[PDB]
């Protein structure tokens, strides 16, 4: 008997994915989550994960690979490989060249997660619903503080966004972007900002204890799913603002040290197949990088122009850049003030 250990973010499953996988193949599946790139690179640096797969960002895989964490992904051992969307692995290709060492797994926006009715309660039915204004400007903030603010705990969505909505280049080389006006506006918003957490605002956001937060796309949709579920009349949605947002790739990509290789392979396959990945989308409100699955998944998904958003909307998206060991000192420091207000 063989177990396979996988490394995953929350919320980022279909609640029978790994059930169906051990049926149809025997292997015992270990799965553990995270909320954070920082928390899985730490891990992936500084020893033995134990984990067979795990799902970082495409850019944090970058990273990862200059030190030889990654072990290549045997081609031959993924047949259906081709159901991958070509455009999709191009861009992953930017980071992993030749797509030698991850699999496209997901794909999302970072925009603002909000309750509907509350924001149109506090700032009126003309609130910026369509900017970062309802959540980066401190005119904004102050009138929304006592419903609940909730930022990424994430230094480099937080920062890229702040410099974009400042004018600047959202993955900028020069400090003083960042020590000066980057963290400037922080500190202005930072006493309305309830807590930093990556995870829990997706509950709070569901119950209405949080009114506006930073929020990853399917995330924000799953919390709309869920006050619908609950029948508790809670009204949420999500927003891609009109000036850019954060756009990203998850992937699945193997240890060098992993323990069973073959069977992360076979997980590896079954993610691939269509109706398996399509499942998937259905439950976590996620676009999946599968062009052969696409029109398996759910019109309510599909259809979503903040899940697979159209033309107009992908053309004002950036993507996170690998920032050289000066500018992530200069970032990670002011992240840090900022945090402690
Ligand atoms: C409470 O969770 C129990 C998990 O049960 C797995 C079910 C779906 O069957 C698949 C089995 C035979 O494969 C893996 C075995 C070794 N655990
Ligand atoms: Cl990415």
Redesign the pocket.
Same mark, same amino acid.
């Given at each position: 008997?063989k177990?396979l250990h996988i490394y995953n973010w929350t919320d980022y499953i279909a609640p029978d994915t790994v059930?169906?996988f051990? $049926?149809e193949?025997?292997? $015992?599946?270990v799965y553990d989550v995270f909320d954070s790139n920082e928390v899985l690179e730490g891990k992936l640096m500084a020893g033995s994960t134990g984990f067979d797969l795990v799902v970082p960002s495409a850019y944090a895989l970058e990273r990862q690979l200059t030190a030889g964490v990654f072990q290549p992904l045997d081609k031959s051992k993924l047949p259906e490989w081709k159901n991958l969307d070509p455009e999709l692995l191009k861009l992953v290709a930017k980071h992993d060249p030749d797509n030698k060492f991850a699999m496209p797994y997901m794909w999302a926006t970072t925009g603002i997660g909000y309750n509907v009715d509350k924001v149109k309660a506090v700032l009126g039915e003309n609130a910026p619903v369509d900017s970062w204004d309802l959540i980066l400007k401190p005119e904004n903030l102050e009138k929304l503080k006592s419903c609940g603010v909730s930022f990424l705990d994430d230094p480099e969505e937080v920062f890229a966004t702040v410099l974009n909505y400042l004018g600047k280049d959202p993955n900028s080389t020069k400090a003083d972007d960042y020590t000066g006006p980057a963290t400037d506006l922080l500190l202005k918003l930072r006493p309305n900002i309830r807590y930093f957490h990556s995870s829990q605002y997706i509950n709070d956001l569901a119950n209405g204890d949080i009114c506006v937060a930073i929020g990853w796309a399917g995330d924000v949709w799953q919390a709309s799913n869920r006050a619908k579920e609950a029948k508790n009349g809670v009204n949420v949605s999500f927003s891609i603002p009109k000036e850019g947002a954060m756009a990203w790739f998850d992937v699945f990509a193997m240890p060098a040290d992993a323990k069973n290789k073959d069977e992360a392979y076979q997980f590896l396959n079954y993610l691939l197949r269509p109706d398996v990945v399509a499942h998937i989308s259905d439950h976590v409100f996620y676009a999946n990088a599968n062009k052969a699955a696409t029109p398996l998944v759910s019109a309510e998904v599909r259809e979503n122009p903040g899940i697979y958003p159209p033309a107009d909307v992908r053309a004002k998206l950036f993507t996170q850049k690998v920032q050289d060991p000066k500018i992530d000192r200069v970032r990670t420091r002011a992240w840090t003030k900022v945090k402690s207000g």
């Open positions: 008997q177990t059930a169906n051990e $049926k193949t025997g292997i $015992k599946v």
